[PDB]
């Protein structure tokens, strides 16, 4: 299909952007802004915790993951309340889960406050992961083109 352009991505993510059905596996404090191994260790811990909770009749919270030029919003599906919101410049790393095509996570937070948000997607995680890659790329592209033209 047609290759992406900056303008296509700007229109896709402006305003309310796009949203995906998911469940929140958990949130974990982590030591660094980025890293595959750090993220997977966090994913495994949070999945272990969710499995223990499941054995006690707990369920993961049903959410929308909203992706836009404003960053990522975690929205409670039942009530529609925004439970978590991180702007683009406070999201540091996107992690895939090699064990699970329906999970991914992201590291976010300012310095000394890095946290891993682990997400179980309703469908495959890859389209969401790619949307995040594209979101960050178009914002970076637009910034760089502005900088090159002013110099």
């Amino acid at each position: 299909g047609p290759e992406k352009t900056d303008e296509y991505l700007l229109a896709r993510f402006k305003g309310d952007g796009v949203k995906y059905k998911a469940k929140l596996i958990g949130i974990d404090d982590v030591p660094d802004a980025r890293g595959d191994k750090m993220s997977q260790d966090s994913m495994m811990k949070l999945k272990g915790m969710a499995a223990a909770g499941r054995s006690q009749g707990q369920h993961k919270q049903r959410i929308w993951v909203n992706i836009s030029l404003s960053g990522i919003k975690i929205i409670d599906e039942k009530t529609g309340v925004i439970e978590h919101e991180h702007p683009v410049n406070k999201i540091s790393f996107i992690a895939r889960d090699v064990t699970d095509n329906r999970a991914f996570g992201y590291v976010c937070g300012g310095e000394g406050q890095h946290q891993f948000f682990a997400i179980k997607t309703g469908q495959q995680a890859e389209p969401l992961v790619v949307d995040l890659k594209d979101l960050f790329q178009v914002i970076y592209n637009v910034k760089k083109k502005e900088e090159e033209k002013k110099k």
Partner: peptide, 13 residues
């Protein structure tokens, strides 16, 4: 297969 950095990330608040 791996993850990726956000080049727009700014740690300081």
């Amino acid at each position: 297969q791996n993850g990726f950095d956000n080049p727009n990330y700014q740690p300081q608040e």
